[PDB]
Amino acid sequence: MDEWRKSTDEWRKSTDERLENLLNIVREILDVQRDMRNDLSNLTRKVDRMDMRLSRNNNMIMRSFAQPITEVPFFNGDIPDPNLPRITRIEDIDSLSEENCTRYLKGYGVSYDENDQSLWKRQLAKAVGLTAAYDESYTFSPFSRVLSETEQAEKIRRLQQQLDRFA
Amino acid sequence: MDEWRKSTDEWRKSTDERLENLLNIVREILDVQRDMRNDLSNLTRKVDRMDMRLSRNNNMIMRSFAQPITEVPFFNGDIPDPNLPRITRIEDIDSLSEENCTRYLKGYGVSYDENDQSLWKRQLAKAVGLTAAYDESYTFSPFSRVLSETEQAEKIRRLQQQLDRFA
Amino acid sequence: MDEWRKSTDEWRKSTDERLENLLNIVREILDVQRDMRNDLSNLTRKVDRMDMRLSRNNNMIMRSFAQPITEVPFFNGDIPDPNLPRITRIEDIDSLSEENCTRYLKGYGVSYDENDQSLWKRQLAKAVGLTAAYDESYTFSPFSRVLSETEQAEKIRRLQQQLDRFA
Amino acid sequence: MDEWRKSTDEWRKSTDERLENLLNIVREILDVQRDMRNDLSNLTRKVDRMDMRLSRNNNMIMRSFAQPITEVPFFNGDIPDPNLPRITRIEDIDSLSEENCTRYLKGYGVSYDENDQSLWKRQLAKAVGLTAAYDESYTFSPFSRVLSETEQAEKIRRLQQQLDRFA
Amino acid sequence: MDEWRKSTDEWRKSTDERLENLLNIVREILDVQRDMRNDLSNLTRKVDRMDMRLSRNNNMIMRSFAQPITEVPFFNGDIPDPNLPRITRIEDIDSLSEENCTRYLKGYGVSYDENDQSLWKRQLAKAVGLTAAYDESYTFSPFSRVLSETEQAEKIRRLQQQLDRFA
Amino acid sequence: MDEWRKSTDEWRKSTDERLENLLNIVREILDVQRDMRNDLSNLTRKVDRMDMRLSRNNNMIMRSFAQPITEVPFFNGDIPDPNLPRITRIEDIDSLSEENCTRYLKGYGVSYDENDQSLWKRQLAKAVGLTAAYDESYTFSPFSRVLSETEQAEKIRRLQQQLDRFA
């Protein structure tokens, strides 16, 4: 019917506009997601590095009071491997297997020399926080349902493409 | 009209597909929200605990230089209660009402003994950062429009169910 | 056709409800975005302030062991200006141009006196972490595709209004 | 002969006076000896006590730098008995035979309690110079031709009497 | 009788020589006395000054461990006057009567300014051993049968003259 | 005359005994002198060595507070030679002419190696009192009317022999 006709025609003009609005809104919602995910995945890294430095500070103070020290976590906030011998004294750094020195030196951020293993012990003693007058005078002997981060970042990437290709 | 008929029929085949695409997109947008909310509500807790440890470190250094100390916040980043007497010396921990010791010991993270109140003073003196040679030799006398976090986490939960039930 | 008629009429009653559901869902998705953005932009500020305090703690310990000190970042986690002379000793604070003192004092959080420039050097020496027995006895001479934070916060604001005005 | 007579008579009057002068001189020489001997035998005691305090000071500084300590002599400048176990750590004071504690406590000057052996370990740890933050927090477990000085002082005494009795 | 005569004459030649020998011996005995008395009365002064410096060292170490200090004797090994208020803190030096500052400053060896009483408090705080980081930052408010030594030294002097005049 | 005769004979028996008494007294006076001179010339040496150790203690404390150091006298209480460059820092020990190192090492008591000059700098840095955490980590580059004591001791020796030979 003719008025019925034109009812549907105006209803065209409504609905198509409406769906265009929702497509626009969803595009910009997805952009804000992808940006917020990066800005949060940068704090997690900065906070983990601050945590390693905080534990090292505590060790330095304890050595000033002549007390033993405790454990220090790696870059990325994971406990040192349970295979590795603990470290509470210079004398513990002294007897390390030359292959458990590299795991520690890579764990913390230090940048060492791959061919000149003269001073690796002292690198590690400074990284752990063993700087006191008795420790600087020691004389090391030579070597004998849940998702994860990148998951949902990738999820957003494919979701954006999936929505784009159908427009 | 017959071509008019088939115009509408193809328009079926378009629009229903379109609405299915938007339902798919909104489901996965909501999942990324729920996961990002947890990953951020875990940093807030980790950062608050780091803040308590940072203030305690500052107190330890100040005691090494023989100066008075300052305030230390609880687990969850809230100032100690304003009713509680301040703490700047061992002699302030010494005269605590035995019921203002438990609020402090619960505030910080320490795990004490509920029946053996012999050493609660020393627990608290270590938690606040009162470790110096003069403080370890002290000899304590015996007791005589905005939303919040869980709000919008719950909001996401009900929103997900609300959308699911209508599909 | 009459059954064809009523098919379309029931199809009214379906589709309009469906679009109302998606408008509701998108409103509350946008609210959760705007709240999460603020709760994350508050951690970034708190973490930056904690970072300045952490570097200052490291300097204090180094002075306890009689060693030189290093650089300390501002409130908001940006390296001091490259024009400014570095600071590693009291004697470096002593010879500062009276106009490079205000940049440092504003950089760190200290609140100074604008007319009584007697003690600005000591303010800065405490802000950087130069508190040791030799430094407290020094006797300063007188003066002779990526988006950013607020971008996408504003984006959310306009996006919310844009969606509201079309409902 | 008469002039010969009077020559001898005047020679009386000379010689007897002369011997009286030498007796007077020797009396006061002997008094100055007896007084100088005491004034020197008081410095030897004061210097020996200062030596014990000087070694104790050296130990305190070494503990401030977190290093081991050395030996401390008794009141009267004699090395501790060679039977006694050495002392370089708190853990060495901890395992002492309860009868090698009294020799040390008598050696140094400390005045202890003969019946209340609760705190003898801490007395000794302070006497040797073991005061550092780690040592004040330790928690000791309970017990399971030449002459000499007085020679020649006595010599002077008898010499004075010997000369007096013959006048 | 003639042989009797010559017996006495040879006895002359003996006895006079003998008395000359004893006079010579007593002269040089008295010289050695006068020299030994000075060489001993110089150690007593040197040892007394060393004792003041030793007590001051002990106070400095105690302040490094953040403990209170004790008494320090004057140049010449006499306890500070019993009228004078004791000194165990900076806050005790702060409230001194401006006339009990001069007795202390004269007691110890310091050389002050008689007209410029600006810095007398700090002179005294260094003389007593109050150098720690908290004490260097304090901000003092402005002022509102026995003989003795010389006895027997004089005795030797008169004794030497007494013997000389009779030869 | 006969009674005159016997008067002189009894006067024999008196005077000869008297002179024998004075010879006995002077012998034992001289022995006490020779023994007291040694017992005093041993304190002077012990006190001089204590003085070197006392100045070294003062330097160690000053380094704990991060301050510069002062001069230290030799074994025998004489100021270091005025030709020698002063020492107030590690960097002053570093640039020493290799021939001003031996004068210092002989001055203080240290016993070095005459052919292995590797570690002479560190010997001297410990002898002067330069032990702090910054100084143990430094990395030295390689070398490019009055009498005196023995006078009057000898005087007593010859005096004793002189008196003996005439008896």
Side-chain angles (χ1 to χ4, degrees), chain C residues 13-34:
Chain C
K13 297 310 290 322
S14 170
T15 300
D16 265 333
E17 294 293 328
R18 300 262 304 285
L19 287 202
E20 294 294 328
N21 270 325
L22 281 72
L23 276 177
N24 263 3
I25 298 318
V26 173
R27 298 291 180 90
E28 292 181 354
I29 282 283
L30 260 174
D31 284 334
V32 174
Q33 294 297 109
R34 169 170 44 71

PDB file of all heavy atoms in Angstrom, chain C residues 13-34:
ATOM      1  N   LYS C  13       9.017  -6.109  15.343  1.00  0.00           N
ATOM      2  CA  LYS C  13       9.069  -6.277  16.788  1.00  0.00           C
ATOM      3  C   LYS C  13      10.369  -6.925  17.217  1.00  0.00           C
ATOM      4  O   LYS C  13      10.832  -6.707  18.340  1.00  0.00           O
ATOM      5  CB  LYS C  13       7.872  -7.092  17.267  1.00  0.00           C
ATOM      6  CG  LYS C  13       6.543  -6.418  17.006  1.00  0.00           C
ATOM      7  CD  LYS C  13       6.558  -4.984  17.497  1.00  0.00           C
ATOM      8  CE  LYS C  13       6.587  -4.922  19.014  1.00  0.00           C
ATOM      9  NZ  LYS C  13       5.746  -5.983  19.632  1.00  0.00           N
ATOM     10  N   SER C  14      10.978  -7.714  16.339  1.00  0.00           N
ATOM     11  CA  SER C  14      12.300  -8.243  16.639  1.00  0.00           C
ATOM     12  C   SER C  14      13.364  -7.163  16.504  1.00  0.00           C
ATOM     13  O   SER C  14      14.041  -6.806  17.477  1.00  0.00           O
ATOM     14  CB  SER C  14      12.612  -9.419  15.720  1.00  0.00           C
ATOM     15  OG  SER C  14      13.971  -9.794  15.837  1.00  0.00           O
ATOM     16  N   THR C  15      13.513  -6.615  15.301  1.00  0.00           N
ATOM     17  CA  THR C  15      14.706  -5.842  14.996  1.00  0.00           C
ATOM     18  C   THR C  15      14.818  -4.599  15.857  1.00  0.00           C
ATOM     19  O   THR C  15      15.910  -4.261  16.326  1.00  0.00           O
ATOM     20  CB  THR C  15      14.722  -5.472  13.526  1.00  0.00           C
ATOM     21  OG1 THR C  15      14.723  -6.675  12.754  1.00  0.00           O
ATOM     22  CG2 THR C  15      15.949  -4.681  13.207  1.00  0.00           C
ATOM     23  N   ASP C  16      13.712  -3.895  16.075  1.00  0.00           N
ATOM     24  CA  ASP C  16      13.815  -2.686  16.881  1.00  0.00           C
ATOM     25  C   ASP C  16      14.294  -3.006  18.288  1.00  0.00           C
ATOM     26  O   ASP C  16      15.157  -2.307  18.833  1.00  0.00           O
ATOM     27  CB  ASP C  16      12.487  -1.945  16.914  1.00  0.00           C
ATOM     28  CG  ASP C  16      12.410  -0.865  15.861  1.00  0.00           C
ATOM     29  OD1 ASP C  16      13.477  -0.349  15.472  1.00  0.00           O
ATOM     30  OD2 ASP C  16      11.291  -0.525  15.428  1.00  0.00           O
ATOM     31  N   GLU C  17      13.772  -4.074  18.881  1.00  0.00           N
ATOM     32  CA  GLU C  17      14.280  -4.493  20.178  1.00  0.00           C
ATOM     33  C   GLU C  17      15.770  -4.774  20.109  1.00  0.00           C
ATOM     34  O   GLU C  17      16.527  -4.381  21.005  1.00  0.00           O
ATOM     35  CB  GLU C  17      13.528  -5.727  20.663  1.00  0.00           C
ATOM     36  CG  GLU C  17      12.075  -5.472  20.963  1.00  0.00           C
ATOM     37  CD  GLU C  17      11.889  -4.551  22.145  1.00  0.00           C
ATOM     38  OE1 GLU C  17      12.736  -4.584  23.061  1.00  0.00           O
ATOM     39  OE2 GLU C  17      10.898  -3.792  22.163  1.00  0.00           O
ATOM     40  N   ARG C  18      16.210  -5.448  19.050  1.00  0.00           N
ATOM     41  CA  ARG C  18      17.618  -5.802  18.954  1.00  0.00           C
ATOM     42  C   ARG C  18      18.490  -4.558  18.954  1.00  0.00           C
ATOM     43  O   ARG C  18      19.466  -4.465  19.709  1.00  0.00           O
ATOM     44  CB  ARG C  18      17.853  -6.631  17.700  1.00  0.00           C
ATOM     45  CG  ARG C  18      17.051  -7.902  17.688  1.00  0.00           C
ATOM     46  CD  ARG C  18      17.880  -9.065  18.153  1.00  0.00           C
ATOM     47  NE  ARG C  18      19.085  -9.185  17.351  1.00  0.00           N
ATOM     48  CZ  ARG C  18      19.104  -9.659  16.113  1.00  0.00           C
ATOM     49  NH1 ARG C  18      17.982 -10.062  15.539  1.00  0.00           N
ATOM     50  NH2 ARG C  18      20.246  -9.731  15.449  1.00  0.00           N
ATOM     51  N   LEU C  19      18.133  -3.574  18.139  1.00  0.00           N
ATOM     52  CA  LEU C  19      18.952  -2.376  18.104  1.00  0.00           C
ATOM     53  C   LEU C  19      18.912  -1.639  19.428  1.00  0.00           C
ATOM     54  O   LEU C  19      19.902  -1.008  19.814  1.00  0.00           O
ATOM     55  CB  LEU C  19      18.522  -1.462  16.974  1.00  0.00           C
ATOM     56  CG  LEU C  19      18.917  -1.994  15.607  1.00  0.00           C
ATOM     57  CD1 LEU C  19      18.959  -0.863  14.618  1.00  0.00           C
ATOM     58  CD2 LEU C  19      20.244  -2.693  15.665  1.00  0.00           C
ATOM     59  N   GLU C  20      17.803  -1.718  20.154  1.00  0.00           N
ATOM     60  CA  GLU C  20      17.799  -1.108  21.475  1.00  0.00           C
ATOM     61  C   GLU C  20      18.769  -1.812  22.404  1.00  0.00           C
ATOM     62  O   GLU C  20      19.445  -1.166  23.213  1.00  0.00           O
ATOM     63  CB  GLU C  20      16.396  -1.105  22.055  1.00  0.00           C
ATOM     64  CG  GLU C  20      15.475  -0.213  21.273  1.00  0.00           C
ATOM     65  CD  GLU C  20      15.874   1.240  21.390  1.00  0.00           C
ATOM     66  OE1 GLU C  20      16.405   1.625  22.452  1.00  0.00           O
ATOM     67  OE2 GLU C  20      15.666   1.997  20.420  1.00  0.00           O
ATOM     68  N   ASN C  21      18.868  -3.132  22.300  1.00  0.00           N
ATOM     69  CA  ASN C  21      19.829  -3.828  23.144  1.00  0.00           C
ATOM     70  C   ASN C  21      21.252  -3.389  22.850  1.00  0.00           C
ATOM     71  O   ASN C  21      22.031  -3.141  23.776  1.00  0.00           O
ATOM     72  CB  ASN C  21      19.698  -5.332  22.989  1.00  0.00           C
ATOM     73  CG  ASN C  21      18.718  -5.910  23.958  1.00  0.00           C
ATOM     74  OD1 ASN C  21      18.611  -5.445  25.089  1.00  0.00           O
ATOM     75  ND2 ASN C  21      17.998  -6.937  23.535  1.00  0.00           N
ATOM     76  N   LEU C  22      21.619  -3.280  21.576  1.00  0.00           N
ATOM     77  CA  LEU C  22      22.991  -2.869  21.291  1.00  0.00           C
ATOM     78  C   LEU C  22      23.265  -1.442  21.736  1.00  0.00           C
ATOM     79  O   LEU C  22      24.368  -1.143  22.201  1.00  0.00           O
ATOM     80  CB  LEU C  22      23.350  -3.057  19.827  1.00  0.00           C
ATOM     81  CG  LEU C  22      23.670  -4.500  19.481  1.00  0.00           C
ATOM     82  CD1 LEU C  22      22.467  -5.387  19.478  1.00  0.00           C
ATOM     83  CD2 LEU C  22      24.356  -4.530  18.153  1.00  0.00           C
ATOM     84  N   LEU C  23      22.297  -0.541  21.613  1.00  0.00           N
ATOM     85  CA  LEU C  23      22.551   0.789  22.152  1.00  0.00           C
ATOM     86  C   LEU C  23      22.783   0.744  23.653  1.00  0.00           C
ATOM     87  O   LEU C  23      23.677   1.425  24.167  1.00  0.00           O
ATOM     88  CB  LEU C  23      21.425   1.745  21.812  1.00  0.00           C
ATOM     89  CG  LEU C  23      21.639   2.322  20.428  1.00  0.00           C
ATOM     90  CD1 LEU C  23      20.493   3.218  20.050  1.00  0.00           C
ATOM     91  CD2 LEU C  23      22.918   3.095  20.451  1.00  0.00           C
ATOM     92  N   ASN C  24      22.008  -0.056  24.377  1.00  0.00           N
ATOM     93  CA  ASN C  24      22.247  -0.144  25.811  1.00  0.00           C
ATOM     94  C   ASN C  24      23.640  -0.675  26.105  1.00  0.00           C
ATOM     95  O   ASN C  24      24.365  -0.125  26.948  1.00  0.00           O
ATOM     96  CB  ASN C  24      21.200  -1.028  26.467  1.00  0.00           C
ATOM     97  CG  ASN C  24      20.077  -0.232  27.055  1.00  0.00           C
ATOM     98  OD1 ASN C  24      20.039   0.990  26.929  1.00  0.00           O
ATOM     99  ND2 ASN C  24      19.150  -0.912  27.713  1.00  0.00           N
ATOM    100  N   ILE C  25      24.044  -1.725  25.403  1.00  0.00           N
ATOM    101  CA  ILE C  25      25.340  -2.320  25.680  1.00  0.00           C
ATOM    102  C   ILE C  25      26.451  -1.326  25.405  1.00  0.00           C
ATOM    103  O   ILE C  25      27.417  -1.229  26.166  1.00  0.00           O
ATOM    104  CB  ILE C  25      25.522  -3.607  24.872  1.00  0.00           C
ATOM    105  CG1 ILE C  25      24.474  -4.605  25.290  1.00  0.00           C
ATOM    106  CG2 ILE C  25      26.852  -4.200  25.155  1.00  0.00           C
ATOM    107  CD1 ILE C  25      24.278  -4.636  26.752  1.00  0.00           C
ATOM    108  N   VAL C  26      26.342  -0.568  24.321  1.00  0.00           N
ATOM    109  CA  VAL C  26      27.434   0.332  23.993  1.00  0.00           C
ATOM    110  C   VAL C  26      27.525   1.466  25.003  1.00  0.00           C
ATOM    111  O   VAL C  26      28.624   1.894  25.361  1.00  0.00           O
ATOM    112  CB  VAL C  26      27.303   0.842  22.556  1.00  0.00           C
ATOM    113  CG1 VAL C  26      28.331   1.877  22.297  1.00  0.00           C
ATOM    114  CG2 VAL C  26      27.518  -0.291  21.610  1.00  0.00           C
ATOM    115  N   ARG C  27      26.393   1.967  25.499  1.00  0.00           N
ATOM    116  CA  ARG C  27      26.481   2.958  26.571  1.00  0.00           C
ATOM    117  C   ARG C  27      27.292   2.450  27.744  1.00  0.00           C
ATOM    118  O   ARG C  27      28.196   3.136  28.228  1.00  0.00           O
ATOM    119  CB  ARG C  27      25.104   3.384  27.063  1.00  0.00           C
ATOM    120  CG  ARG C  27      24.240   4.039  26.043  1.00  0.00           C
ATOM    121  CD  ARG C  27      24.824   5.388  25.705  1.00  0.00           C
ATOM    122  NE  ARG C  27      24.027   6.075  24.704  1.00  0.00           N
ATOM    123  CZ  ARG C  27      23.016   6.886  24.983  1.00  0.00           C
ATOM    124  NH1 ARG C  27      22.674   7.105  26.242  1.00  0.00           N
ATOM    125  NH2 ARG C  27      22.347   7.470  24.002  1.00  0.00           N
ATOM    126  N   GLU C  28      26.992   1.258  28.230  1.00  0.00           N
ATOM    127  CA  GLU C  28      27.722   0.871  29.430  1.00  0.00           C
ATOM    128  C   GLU C  28      29.154   0.442  29.130  1.00  0.00           C
ATOM    129  O   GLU C  28      30.029   0.590  29.992  1.00  0.00           O
ATOM    130  CB  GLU C  28      26.951  -0.178  30.207  1.00  0.00           C
ATOM    131  CG  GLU C  28      25.695   0.442  30.785  1.00  0.00           C
ATOM    132  CD  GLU C  28      24.862  -0.519  31.592  1.00  0.00           C
ATOM    133  OE1 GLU C  28      25.202  -1.713  31.626  1.00  0.00           O
ATOM    134  OE2 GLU C  28      23.859  -0.078  32.194  1.00  0.00           O
ATOM    135  N   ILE C  29      29.443  -0.026  27.917  1.00  0.00           N
ATOM    136  CA  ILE C  29      30.840  -0.237  27.548  1.00  0.00           C
ATOM    137  C   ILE C  29      31.610   1.072  27.615  1.00  0.00           C
ATOM    138  O   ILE C  29      32.733   1.129  28.130  1.00  0.00           O
ATOM    139  CB  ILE C  29      30.943  -0.867  26.152  1.00  0.00           C
ATOM    140  CG1 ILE C  29      30.637  -2.341  26.224  1.00  0.00           C
ATOM    141  CG2 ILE C  29      32.329  -0.705  25.621  1.00  0.00           C
ATOM    142  CD1 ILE C  29      31.756  -3.105  26.765  1.00  0.00           C
ATOM    143  N   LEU C  30      31.024   2.147  27.103  1.00  0.00           N
ATOM    144  CA  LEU C  30      31.733   3.417  27.112  1.00  0.00           C
ATOM    145  C   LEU C  30      31.931   3.938  28.523  1.00  0.00           C
ATOM    146  O   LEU C  30      32.954   4.560  28.816  1.00  0.00           O
ATOM    147  CB  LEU C  30      30.995   4.432  26.267  1.00  0.00           C
ATOM    148  CG  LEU C  30      31.666   4.532  24.926  1.00  0.00           C
ATOM    149  CD1 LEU C  30      30.882   5.414  24.033  1.00  0.00           C
ATOM    150  CD2 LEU C  30      32.993   5.116  25.175  1.00  0.00           C
ATOM    151  N   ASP C  31      30.978   3.714  29.419  1.00  0.00           N
ATOM    152  CA  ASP C  31      31.219   4.142  30.790  1.00  0.00           C
ATOM    153  C   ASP C  31      32.386   3.401  31.405  1.00  0.00           C
ATOM    154  O   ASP C  31      33.227   4.010  32.072  1.00  0.00           O
ATOM    155  CB  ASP C  31      29.986   3.970  31.657  1.00  0.00           C
ATOM    156  CG  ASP C  31      28.950   5.022  31.391  1.00  0.00           C
ATOM    157  OD1 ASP C  31      29.337   6.123  30.945  1.00  0.00           O
ATOM    158  OD2 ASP C  31      27.759   4.773  31.665  1.00  0.00           O
ATOM    159  N   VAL C  32      32.469   2.094  31.203  1.00  0.00           N
ATOM    160  CA  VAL C  32      33.583   1.380  31.810  1.00  0.00           C
ATOM    161  C   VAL C  32      34.908   1.865  31.236  1.00  0.00           C
ATOM    162  O   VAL C  32      35.907   1.949  31.952  1.00  0.00           O
ATOM    163  CB  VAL C  32      33.409  -0.133  31.651  1.00  0.00           C
ATOM    164  CG1 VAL C  32      34.624  -0.837  32.143  1.00  0.00           C
ATOM    165  CG2 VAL C  32      32.242  -0.573  32.447  1.00  0.00           C
ATOM    166  N   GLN C  33      34.945   2.206  29.949  1.00  0.00           N
ATOM    167  CA  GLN C  33      36.166   2.799  29.403  1.00  0.00           C
ATOM    168  C   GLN C  33      36.556   4.066  30.134  1.00  0.00           C
ATOM    169  O   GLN C  33      37.706   4.227  30.541  1.00  0.00           O
ATOM    170  CB  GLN C  33      36.009   3.109  27.927  1.00  0.00           C
ATOM    171  CG  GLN C  33      35.855   1.922  27.096  1.00  0.00           C
ATOM    172  CD  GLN C  33      37.075   1.098  27.187  1.00  0.00           C
ATOM    173  OE1 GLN C  33      37.075   0.030  27.777  1.00  0.00           O
ATOM    174  NE2 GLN C  33      38.149   1.592  26.611  1.00  0.00           N
ATOM    175  N   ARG C  34      35.628   4.998  30.274  1.00  0.00           N
ATOM    176  CA  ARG C  34      36.004   6.272  30.858  1.00  0.00           C
ATOM    177  C   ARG C  34      36.479   6.111  32.285  1.00  0.00           C
ATOM    178  O   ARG C  34      37.326   6.873  32.738  1.00  0.00           O
ATOM    179  CB  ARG C  34      34.838   7.242  30.796  1.00  0.00           C
ATOM    180  CG  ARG C  34      35.036   8.482  31.605  1.00  0.00           C
ATOM    181  CD  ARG C  34      33.968   9.513  31.318  1.00  0.00           C
ATOM    182  NE  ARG C  34      32.630   8.941  31.255  1.00  0.00           N
ATOM    183  CZ  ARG C  34      31.961   8.480  32.305  1.00  0.00           C
ATOM    184  NH1 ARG C  34      32.502   8.513  33.513  1.00  0.00           N
ATOM    185  NH2 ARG C  34      30.744   7.985  32.146  1.00  0.00           N
TER     186      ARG C  34
END
